[PDB]
Amino acid sequence: IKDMFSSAMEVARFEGAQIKTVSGIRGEIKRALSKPEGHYRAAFEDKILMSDIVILRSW
Amino acid sequence: AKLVHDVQKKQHRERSQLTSRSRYGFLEKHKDYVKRAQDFHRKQSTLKVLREKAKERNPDEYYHAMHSRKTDAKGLLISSRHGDEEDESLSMDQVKLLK
Amino acid sequence: AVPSVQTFGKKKSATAVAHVKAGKGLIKVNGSPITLVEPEILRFKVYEPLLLVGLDKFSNIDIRVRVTGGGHVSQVYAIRQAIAKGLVAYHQKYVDEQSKNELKKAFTSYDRTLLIADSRRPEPK
Amino acid sequence: GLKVPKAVQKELPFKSQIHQMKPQKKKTYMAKRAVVLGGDEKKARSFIQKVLTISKAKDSKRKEQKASQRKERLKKLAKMEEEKSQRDKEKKKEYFAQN
Amino acid sequence: LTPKRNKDNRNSRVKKRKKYQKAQKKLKSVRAVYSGGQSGVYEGEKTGIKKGLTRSVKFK
Amino acid sequence: TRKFGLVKRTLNTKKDQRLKKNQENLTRNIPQVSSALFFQYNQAIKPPYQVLIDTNFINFSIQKKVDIVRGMMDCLLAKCNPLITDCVMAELEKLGPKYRIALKLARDPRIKRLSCSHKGTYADDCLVHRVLQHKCYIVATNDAGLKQRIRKIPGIPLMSVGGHAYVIEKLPDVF
Amino acid sequence: DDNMRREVQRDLLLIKHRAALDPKRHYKKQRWEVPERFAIGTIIEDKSEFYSSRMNRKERKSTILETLMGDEASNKYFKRKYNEIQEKSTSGRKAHYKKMKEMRKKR
Amino acid sequence: VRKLKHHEQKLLKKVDFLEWKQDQGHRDTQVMRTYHIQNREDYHKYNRICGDIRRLANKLSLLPPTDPFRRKHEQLLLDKLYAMGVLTTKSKISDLENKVTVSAICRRRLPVIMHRLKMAETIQDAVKFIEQGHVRVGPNLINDPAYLVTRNMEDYVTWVDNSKIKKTLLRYRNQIDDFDFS
Amino acid sequence: GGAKVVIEPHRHAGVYIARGKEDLLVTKNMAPGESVYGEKRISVEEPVPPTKVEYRVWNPFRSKLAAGIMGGLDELFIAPGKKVLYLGAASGTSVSHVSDVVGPEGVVYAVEFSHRPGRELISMAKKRPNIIPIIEDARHPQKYRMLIGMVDCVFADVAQPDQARIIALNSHMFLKDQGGVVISIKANCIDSTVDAETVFAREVQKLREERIKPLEQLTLEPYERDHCIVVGRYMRSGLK
Numbered sequence A: 001i002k003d004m005f006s007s008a009m010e011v012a013r014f015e016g017a018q019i020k021t022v023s024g025i026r027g028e029i030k031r032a033l034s035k036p037e038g039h040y041r042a043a044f045e046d047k048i049l050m051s052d053i054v055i056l057r058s059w
Numbered sequence B: 001a002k003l004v005h006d007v008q009k010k011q012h013r014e015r016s017q018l019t020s021r022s023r024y025g026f027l028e029k030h031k032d033y034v035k036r037a038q039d040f041h042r043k044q045s046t047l048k049v050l051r052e053k054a055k056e057r058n059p060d061e062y063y064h065a066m067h068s069r070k071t072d073a074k075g076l077l078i079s080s081r082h083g084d085e086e087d088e089s090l091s092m093d094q095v096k097l098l099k
Numbered sequence C: 001a002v003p004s005v006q007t008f009g010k011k012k013s014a015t016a017v018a019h020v021k022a023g024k025g026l027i028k029v030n031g032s033p034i035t036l037v038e039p040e041i042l043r044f045k046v047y048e049p050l051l052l053v054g055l056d057k058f059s060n061i062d063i064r065v066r067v068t069g070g071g072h073v074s075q076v077y078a079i080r081q082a083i084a085k086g087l088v089a090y091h092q093k094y095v096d097e098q099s100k101n102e103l104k105k106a107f108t109s110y111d112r113t114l115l116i117a118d119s120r121r122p123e124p125k
Numbered sequence D: 001g002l003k004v005p006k007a008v009q010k011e012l013p014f015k016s017q018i019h020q021m022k023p024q025k026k027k028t029y030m031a032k033r034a035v036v037l038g039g040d041e042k043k044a045r046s047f048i049q050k051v052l053t054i055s056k057a058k059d060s061k062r063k064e065q066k067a068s069q070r071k072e073r074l075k076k077l078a079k080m081e082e083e084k085s086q087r088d089k090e091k092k093k094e095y096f097a098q099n
Numbered sequence E: 001l002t003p004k005r006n007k008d009n010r011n012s013r014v015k016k017r018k019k020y021q022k023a024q025k026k027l028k029s030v031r032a033v034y035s036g037g038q039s040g041v042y043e044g045e046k047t048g049i050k051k052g053l054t055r056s057v058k059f060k
Numbered sequence F: 001t002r003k004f005g006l007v008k009r010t011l012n013t014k015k016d017q018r019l020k021k022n023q024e025n026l027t028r029n030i031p032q033v034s035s036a037l038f039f040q041y042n043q044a045i046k047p048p049y050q051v052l053i054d055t056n057f058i059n060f061s062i063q064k065k066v067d068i069v070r071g072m073m074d075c076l077l078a079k080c081n082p083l084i085t086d087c088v089m090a091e092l093e094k095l096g097p098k099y100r101i102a103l104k105l106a107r108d109p110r111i112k113r114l115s116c117s118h119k120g121t122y123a124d125d126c127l128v129h130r131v132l133q134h135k136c137y138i139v140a141t142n143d144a145g146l147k148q149r150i151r152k153i154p155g156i157p158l159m160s161v162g163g164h165a166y167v168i169e170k171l172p173d174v175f
Numbered sequence G: 001d002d003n004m005r006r007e008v009q010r011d012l013l014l015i016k017h018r019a020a021l022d023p024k025r026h027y028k029k030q031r032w033e034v035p036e037r038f039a040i041g042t043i044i045e046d047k048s049e050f051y052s053s054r055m056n057r058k059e060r061k062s063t064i065l066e067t068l069m070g071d072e073a074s075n076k077y078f079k080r081k082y083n084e085i086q087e088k089s090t091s092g093r094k095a096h097y098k099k100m101k102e103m104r105k106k107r
Numbered sequence H: 001v002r003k004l005k006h007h008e009q010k011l012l013k014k015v016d017f018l019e020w021k022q023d024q025g026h027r028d029t030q031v032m033r034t035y036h037i038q039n040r041e042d043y044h045k046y047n048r049i050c051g052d053i054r055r056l057a058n059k060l061s062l063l064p065p066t067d068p069f070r071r072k073h074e075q076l077l078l079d080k081l082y083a084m085g086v087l088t089t090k091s092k093i094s095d096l097e098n099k100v101t102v103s104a105i106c107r108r109r110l111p112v113i114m115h116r117l118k119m120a121e122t123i124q125d126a127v128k129f130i131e132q133g134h135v136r137v138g139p140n141l142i143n144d145p146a147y148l149v150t151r152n153m154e155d156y157v158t159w160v161d162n163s164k165i166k167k168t169l170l171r172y173r174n175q176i177d178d179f180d181f182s
Numbered sequence I: 001g002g003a004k005v006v007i008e009p010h011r012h013a014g015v016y017i018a019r020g021k022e023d024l025l026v027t028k029n030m031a032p033g034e035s036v037y038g039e040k041r042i043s044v045e046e047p048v049p050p051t052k053v054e055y056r057v058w059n060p061f062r063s064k065l066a067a068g069i070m071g072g073l074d075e076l077f078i079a080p081g082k083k084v085l086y087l088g089a090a091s092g093t094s095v096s097h098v099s100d101v102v103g104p105e106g107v108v109y110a111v112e113f114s115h116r117p118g119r120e121l122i123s124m125a126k127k128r129p130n131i132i133p134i135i136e137d138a139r140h141p142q143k144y145r146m147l148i149g150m151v152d153c154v155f156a157d158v159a160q161p162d163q164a165r166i167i168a169l170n171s172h173m174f175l176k177d178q179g180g181v182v183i184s185i186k187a188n189c190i191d192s193t194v195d196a197e198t199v200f201a202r203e204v205q206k207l208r209e210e211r212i213k214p215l216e217q218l219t220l221e222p223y224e225r226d227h228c229i230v231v232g233r234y235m236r237s238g239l240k
């Protein structure tokens, strides 16, 4: 997942959070990728598409 | 609608794909995802059924139709695309009449 | 219509189908002749079913081998197995049983892995 | 479509074999021989095709609309039968409670 | 805060004019209604003839 | 050069038509709803009405002291023709010598009488058949089962002894 | 015979698919498979009444198909209805899929 | 015999040339048409076996529930009837009257397990093949269809080699090796 | 008007359906080459060369029996070898269609009482030889008991209030046992003080009182208001 964070520190702050696509596919962020900074690895209920947007509902 | 207002059961409209993210056309929503997912699941179900039949072939399986039906080099099934009431090769006098 | 015979030779994942029938004496692997089977240092591994029994057995029959899978040495071992047991099966079915088991005795005295592979492995100690 | 793999489908039973016929790459003699008629016959062919697809799509529209009709009739019919069965199972308990 | 209501409900007479027109259009579905006889030349049955169906009341 | 899998020929109870349970070796019919009917109105019946009586209606008439033709007339406010079918009459005669009063009140020249043509004396079957054939009949009855049959078939008015006079239900022009 | 069924085999298809020839006609639901014994016949309108049912000498044809093809309002309706059925049937199948892929690829 | 008239149906009713009382509904005929038994009396030489096991299961029910002779012999009988595959499990001794059937002891025959594991495609063609002598259980050929099998030998029901229908199915799947002579 | 139809046999033997875009009830023509009351015709060329045989359109608004056929009657008794006694053969309108349904091997006795319809009946029965025109009152079957013997179906298109007595007299004289009795009842011509269902019920009761078991009735409503066809069979012993 590309750009909801600006740094791996930010993703480290937000690890384990539950996200979802706009299709309601639930998911969880797992680990920040190393070289592209705000990019991370998430796991979903099944295969999401390239035309989706993930969402971290915070308050 | 017993105690519901018609200004309360309104129509919430659905949102489109962002114009920056527009080359991946049509942001798909939950009805599109369930149309995707149940299609994938029925095709995986029939693939699993066929894999189980392949596991339980029982190679001492004789039919009488495995005299006529035959198999190509890679092992798959030859299905003759002409007829099965016709013949693919026609005789010399038939070719004489047609020509 | 022709007397023909089909055998199989296998090593690790290579597999070779050999059709032997009566003919003029041509031995062809994958369309090309047998004298083109690379890696060219194991061409005598391919040749030894011919040189163990003489070319006068092959002077009246033509073999063709189709080899898929595997690597270089697994393909030459599949080729030699297919050729050997195809010659044995042809001399069984269409020539006499005495030449059949003379061929089996010669190939088995050289190595019986020309005729029977080593197939299912390992051993759980 | 469902793309069953070749490794599975070469190892299938005889009944479960998949009859998949290859396309034709050679300009065969019967196809290069066979005559098609033109002008009034090709517009007759076009007309019969248009009529048959309009008939088939009209029938598919009609049966889909009947499916949408009878699922909601099933819904209201099951609601009325549930109300009826509730009334029966309380009237029976009334009857036995009096007798 | 009223619901959307009907122009045909705003008149008690026009509502029964338009639910009787609906009723006598439904009556053509259940029975076969005598429309008034042969209009012009007899063109044909215009809707089909079923040779298998018999819509006649059998006794007992 | 014999055949293989040779068997002794026995009889096939599934197939042999010489035995009795194997002696069992299209045109639809959808009867149109009557042109006498609107949706459930029965727009065609008009006075003088004609009313089919049955046995428990006669028994309840005598038990409640209602005359047949005068009770019918002040129920419907119209001129009535009451009809005793031969099966209703057969049922009243089969009721025995306890019901002599009911039988010789059904024997009345003011009560006309039909001629049913069937075997057996099942008046409920006869009344149901001849009313769903024709829809020009009022059914006067007090059987619960016959009342449910008649009020389930449409366009048929139903009369019944209730209280000290006759009542009528599915006739929409009573006043 | 089959030699004559191969001549009247098209207007029997027209009579089988009557229900989608005119958009206002709406027959009663039968199936009508091809009957085993039939006969193709031509209507004689007599020489008593004129001009009402009269199809003239200059427009009498030899099948039902030539009359339906000569009708120009039916040709309008069949072409229009076929184009809308066509563009409904090719709505999202393969040209759409590869133009979506080219949309992804172009940038 | 003549589809008798009405005063005929009434005057004699118990006449029936086809089906008598002691036919028991022709269940012998019906089950041998089902499982295609060659000769007669196989049904009754199975029915004697069914009657014998329900009789000795009855007298094993008779003996008191504590002695090891009784309990050892009923577990031995249950294990042997499992071992010849008449049962499908080692359940209750009530199944030795509910579940032992002349049907199931015909189910353990050789043509019907052949149709069961799809070696043939009908039981008639199975009896065709094993009268023509193509199959074997382990080493030895089987000629008669009366050889029923045990629970161990539903795995080595295989044809013989040089059986040409085996050769036709091998050349159907074109895995036809001929060094192994079939 | 010059179009082409396909002829197809009906369920009823002897009558046909011409399918086009409007389908027509159709009979074969016994006298080919002319129309009798101005109906339209269909000429097929059936296969010495093929012969042009032709067919006549049966108009349900001018024939109670055709209205009954295409409303749907389970059994007509007018059949292709039979004898029909037509009562009230008011002209040759329906008698021609009954005549060529019955065919060349069967006989239609067309009874009519008026005389100018009788003249047209005789001039039609010239070109249809299987019609015996009988100009006599059907209320006295003895006046023509010598001309007719043992019919198979009676058809009654009389429009008189003593209809059931006429039908009963002609049936008891000339109909055979388990033969057909087809009645066209017109409610308004029987009596108009009662409703149509009352007069149909009374006429059916009169038929079973004269021992004709009714099998079937049909209202034939889109073509005629307050009409009916009652199809019965002459049971003669045991309506039960």
Ligand SMILES: [Zn+2]
Pocket (backbone or CB within 6 Å): F085, F086, F087, F088, F116, F117, F122, F123, F126, F127
């Ligand atoms: Zn009765």
